[PDB]
Amino acid sequence: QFSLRVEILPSYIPVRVAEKILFVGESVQMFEKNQEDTFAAELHRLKQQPLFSLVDFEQVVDRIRSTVAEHLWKLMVEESDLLGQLKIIKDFYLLGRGELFQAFIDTAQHMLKTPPTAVTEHDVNVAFQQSAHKVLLDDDNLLPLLHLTIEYHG
Amino acid sequence: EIITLQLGQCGNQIGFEFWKQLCAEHGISPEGIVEEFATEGTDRKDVFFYQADDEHYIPRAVLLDLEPRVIHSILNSPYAKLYNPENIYLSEHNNWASGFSQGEKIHEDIFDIIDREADGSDSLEGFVLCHSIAGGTGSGLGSYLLERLNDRYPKKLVQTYSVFPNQDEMDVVVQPYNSLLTLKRLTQNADCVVLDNTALNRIATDSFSQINQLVSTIMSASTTTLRYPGYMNNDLIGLIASLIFLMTGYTPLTTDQSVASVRKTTVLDVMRRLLQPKNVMVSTNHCYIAILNIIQGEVDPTQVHKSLQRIRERKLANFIPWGPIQVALSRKSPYLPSAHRVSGLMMANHTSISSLFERTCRQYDKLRKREAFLEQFRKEDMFKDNFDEMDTSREIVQQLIDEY
Amino acid sequence: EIITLQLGQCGNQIGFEFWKQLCAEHGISPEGIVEEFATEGTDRKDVFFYQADDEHYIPRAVLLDLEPRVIHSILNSPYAKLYNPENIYLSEHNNWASGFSQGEKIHEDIFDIIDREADGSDSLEGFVLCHSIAGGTGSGLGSYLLERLNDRYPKKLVQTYSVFPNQDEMDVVVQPYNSLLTLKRLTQNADCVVLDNTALNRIATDSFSQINQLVSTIMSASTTTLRYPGYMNNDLIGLIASLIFLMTGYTPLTTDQSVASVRKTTVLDVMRRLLQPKNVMVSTNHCYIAILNIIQGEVDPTQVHKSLQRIRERKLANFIPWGPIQVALSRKSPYLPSAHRVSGLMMANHTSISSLFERTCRQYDKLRKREAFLEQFRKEDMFKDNFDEMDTSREIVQQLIDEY
Numbered sequence: 004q005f006s007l008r009v010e011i012l013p014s015y016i017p018v019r020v021a022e023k024i025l026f027v028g029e030s031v032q033m034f035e036k037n038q039e040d041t042f043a044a045e046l047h048r049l050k051q052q053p054l055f056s057l058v059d060f061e062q063v064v065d066r067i068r069s070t071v072a073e074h075l076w077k078l079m080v081e082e083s084d085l086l087g088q089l090k091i092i093k094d095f096y097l098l099g100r101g102e103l104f105q106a107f108i109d110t111a112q113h114m115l116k117t118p119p120t121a122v123t124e125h126d127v128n129v130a131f132q133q134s135a136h137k138v139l140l141d142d143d144n145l146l147p148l149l150h151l152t153i154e155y156h157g
Numbered sequence: 158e159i160i161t162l163q164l165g166q167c168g169n170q171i172g173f174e175f176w177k178q179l180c181a182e183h184g185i186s187p188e189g190i191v192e193e194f195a196t197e198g199t200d201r202k203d204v205f206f207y208q209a210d211d212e213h214y215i216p217r218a219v220l221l222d223l224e225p226r227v228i229h230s231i232l233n234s235p236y237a238k239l240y241n242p243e244n245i246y247l248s249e250h251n252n253w254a255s256g257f258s259q260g261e262k263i264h265e266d267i268f269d270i271i272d273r274e275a276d277g278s279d280s281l282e283g284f285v286l287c288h289s290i291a292g293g294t295g296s297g298l299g300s301y302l303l304e305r306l307n308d309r310y311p312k313k314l315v316q317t318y319s320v321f322p323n324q325d326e327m328d329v330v331v332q333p334y335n336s337l338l339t340l341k342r343l344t345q346n347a348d349c350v351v352l353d354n355t356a357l358n359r360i361a362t363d364s365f366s367q368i369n370q371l372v373s374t375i376m377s378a379s380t381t382t383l384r385y386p387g388y389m390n391n392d393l394i395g396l397i398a399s400l401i402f403l404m405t406g407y408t409p410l411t412t413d414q415s416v417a418s419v420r421k422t423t424v425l426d427v428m429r430r431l432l433q434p435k436n437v438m439v440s441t442n443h444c445y446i447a448i449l450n451i452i453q454g455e456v457d458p459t460q461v462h463k464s465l466q467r468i469r470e471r472k473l474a475n476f477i478p479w480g481p482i483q484v485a486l487s488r489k490s491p492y493l494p495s496a497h498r499v500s501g502l503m504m505a506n507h508t509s510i511s512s513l514f515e516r517t518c519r520q521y522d523k524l525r526k527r528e529a530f531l532e533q534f535r536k537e538d539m540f541k542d543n544f545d546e547m548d549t550s551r552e553i554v555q556q557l558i559d560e561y
Numbered sequence: 562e563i564i565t566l567q568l569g570q571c572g573n574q575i576g577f578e579f580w581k582q583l584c585a586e587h588g589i590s591p592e593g594i595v596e597e598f599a600t601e602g603t604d605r606k607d608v609f610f611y612q613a614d615d616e617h618y619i620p621r622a623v624l625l626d627l628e629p630r631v632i633h634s635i636l637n638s639p640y641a642k643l644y645n646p647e648n649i650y651l652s653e654h655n656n657w658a659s660g661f662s663q664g665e666k667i668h669e670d671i672f673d674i675i676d677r678e679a680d681g682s683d684s685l686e687g688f689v690l691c692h693s694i695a696g697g698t699g700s701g702l703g704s705y706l707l708e709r710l711n712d713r714y715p716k717k718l719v720q721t722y723s724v725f726p727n728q729d730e731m732d733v734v735v736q737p738y739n740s741l742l743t744l745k746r747l748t749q750n751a752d753c754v755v756l757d758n759t760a761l762n763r764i765a766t767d768s769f770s771q772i773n774q775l776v777s778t779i780m781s782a783s784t785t786t787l788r789y790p791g792y793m794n795n796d797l798i799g800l801i802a803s804l805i806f807l808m809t810g811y812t813p814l815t816t817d818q819s820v821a822s823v824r825k826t827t828v829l830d831v832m833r834r835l836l837q838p839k840n841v842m843v844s845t846n847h848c849y850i851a852i853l854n855i856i857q858g859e860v861d862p863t864q865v866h867k868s869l870q871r872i873r874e875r876k877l878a879n880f881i882p883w884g885p886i887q888v889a890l891s892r893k894s895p896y897l898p899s900a901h902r903v904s905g906l907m908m909a910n911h912t913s914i915s916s917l918f919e920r921t922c923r924q925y926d927k928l929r930k931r932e933a934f935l936e937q938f939r940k941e942d943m944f945k946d947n948f949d950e951m952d953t954s955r956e957i958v959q960q961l962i963d964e965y
Binding site: 098099100101102105106137138139 | 392
Binding site: 417418419420421422423425426429467498 | 611612613614615617619642645646647677680681
């Protein structure tokens with residue numbers, strides 16, 4: 004998790020490209036062919052220029068930016084399916100699968116009108132687990148990933 | 158979950174075609190097998206079916222009848238193997254008193270079957286009843302079952318699809334008595350769908366197979382959202398609370414040959430069509446009590462709001478002066494062709510239904526003054542001494558009419 | 562948007578060929594499909610058609626008739642599937658009184674259809690009526706519909722293409738009564754296109770198929786600019802305000818075989834030709850009230866100004882002494898061949914039309930003095946007691962003639 008600096012940033016460099024730099028790099032450090040050497044020739048080329056031309060500094064950054072972004076979108080959607088994951092969030096977070104909750108509310112009702120204690124946190128995770136099976140939803144995937152929390156004592 | 162109690166020839170058939178429609182919708186094979194294309198289905202099946210170790214699905218249905226012929230024919234159909242032979246019941250060997258007497262006689266086995274079916278469901282919600290109120294079988298047997306059920310299960314809903322006798326056509330000569338008694342029992346025990354052959358066949362025009370296909374269509378469209386979970390209206394009790402006698406109407410009641418006119422069908426035009434008396438399948442500035450419109454297919458809530466606004470401004474409807482509709486949306490089954498771009502079903506409570514009883518009362522009063530066809534009734538124990546039952550039933554119906 | 566109400570055999574046909582012309586212009590397939598070349602079309606279609614979920618387009622038309630034969634033949638045409646079977650209406654089973662009586666009898670279904678069609682349009686502008694004033698069907702049914710429509714919809718325009726009986730030819734023996742009554746109703750309710758078989762066939766010379774093809778041409782050319790939005794005259798009300806009884810004329814009324822003479826056709830020569838009595842399709846220094854010329858094809862406003870100047874100087878026309886024309890331009894459909902370099906249509910209001918009624922009045926007065934063919938009229942309820950209706954209608958027409 005890196006950040007950006009402004010109190011040391013140059014003057015003639017705009018913050019817009021500064022943000023572009025901060026993203027194109029972190030998208031590599033986190034991520035742990037021909038798209039590698041050719042840009043090295045581009046950067047080296049600028050080192051030969053006897054005059055710093057911002058109008059050209061962006062035409063090399065933005066292409067590098069758009070290439071990694073195009074490469075990242077390929078993974079964030081196709082390989083790592085986002086649609087399936089968003090479909091999970093809409094169902095459970097946003098009450099998309101409301102039919103699961105009317106049963107969970109039907110069961111785990113008396114154990115919540117009382118003030119919360121140190122034991123109620125587990126008294127509901129089971130009831131929620133009794134619920135998913137009560138709606139014939141049988142999937143060991145994405146079932147243990149959902150853990151209800153009880154903000155107790157603060 | 159839910160149970161279905163269908164009585165008499167009318168109810169037996171009603172059930173046959175209702176389950177035909179259901180298995181068509183959910184991709185259930187005639188034998189109870191599941192088709193390959195429907196293996197990964199998302200549709201909820203527990204509501205009307207329970208699966209078996211053999212992977213087949215069994216309806217939560219019970220067959221009752223005073224006579225064997227109808228069910229025997231059913232078991233000769235391609236759908237025969239689907240039903241549960243254990244649940245089906247047939248009398249070993251046309252009057253309401255006789256029907257109720259038999260009901261008193263065969264309490265034990267019927268309630269055995271009902272209990273067995275009930276204990277197999279974790280979250281049973283209510284009951285569904287399909288029967289005719291005129292014939293001897295349906296009327297009396299439904300009366301007895303409703304009484305003993307409301308007594309046995311005081312925490313379950315009881316929904317019925319009661320078929321009313323034709324009146325313009327002069328079928329049961331003793332229909333007034335059976336109808337009046339069944340209505341007594343319905344008011345005194347039934348939680349909540351009136352049906353008449355007259356207007357039903359009128360709309361069909363303008364065999365029992367097609368009539369009851371339409372009726373099963375109505376039932377399935379009523380239960381769609383429950384079958385297909387969504388966001389709102391995820392329970393039968395939600396339905397009932399939003400309305401509470403009823404009448405129904407369905408827009409896309411089109412023959413298999415009448416698909417040629419693929420009319421651009423908005424939501425506005427449908428919801429409008431559901432309002433006209435013509436589409437109300439049943440036959441004093443009488444007004445409404447409640448209206449519900451369930452819409453299938455693509456739907457934009459902006460369109461729904463616009464339609465509601467325009468209809469409200471056009472004041473095509475009338476409401477009670479002493480009290481302050483509803484438009485719910487569902488999703489079509491992914492299997493049956495979507496020949497209709499958007500479709501609509503309407504269930505409403507309207508005061509005009511009172512007239513029905515006024516006719517039957519008029520019919521009944523038109524007989525009780527001359528003691529017509531009471532000889533058979535005196536035979537049974539219930540009417541062996543007197544007929545105070547009849548007087549109480551008539552006064553109850555009169556009270557209901559006054560209340561309306 | 563707009564609706565078309567066509568009555569009687571005359572109106573039914575008129576509609577058939579009018580919609581034929583429309584579908585030809587807009588590239589609409591006979592079955593309602595859209596051709597590939599017209600997929601990206603810019604022409605506005607909502608005005609006369611509404612599309613359907615099946616991508617087909619349906620006319621905003623309703624078919625009415627006392628007899629089945631004509632419409633039955635229509636539905637055997639290649640264009641049959643295009644129309645909406647729901648809207649079409651046919652009487653299950655030649656007099657004006659009978660027609661109006663039936664209109665009173667069949668109010669409900671007709672207005673049901675009309676309301677259904679109306680609610681499908683956001684910005685309905687007016688009504689279009691096509692009928693004949695002589696025959697029993699058209700006259701009486703149009704009378705009834707106009708009355709109940711002006712009553713029902715007090716904020717919509719009502720335009721008609723009324724066909725007048727031939728007079729030089731002695732067709733309806735009872736024509737004077739029907740014509741006089743229809744004229745009464747037209748004055749008393751009609752917002753705004755007179756038509757006669759005599760002069761129409763005269764110009765045709767110098768079957769009903771060709772006559773009504775010409776009539777449909779007139780109608781389509783009248784509605785062109787509305788169909789094809791431009792800068793000015795972008796609404797029917799704009800048309801009506803610029804003029805307000807009418808007569809019409811069209812220059813390029815040329816056979817499919819008469820294209821051999823490709824005459825260099827300016828705008829000046831066309832607009833000139835539209836003025837002559839010969840081209841006026843209908844048959845005291847009588848003068849004009851208003852003139853409108855819609856011009857199709859390439860047009861230079863300098864040419865238009867020059868033509869207007871020259872005609873004004875040549876004083877070929879006469880105007881009212883007590884009050885102070887109009888030349889609108891449109892664009893041809895991109896599909897039909899532009900066999901004409903520039904074409905012109907004229908609609909005018911001229912005092913001479915009064916003569917028409919003077920003839921019919923003379924006809925009617927030539928009968929009322931001897932009570933000819935009143936036996937059938939007495940049969941109907943409207944003329945069961947007396948015929949004060951007739952006297953009022955005659956006096957109204959006399960008042961209109963005096964006003965002219």
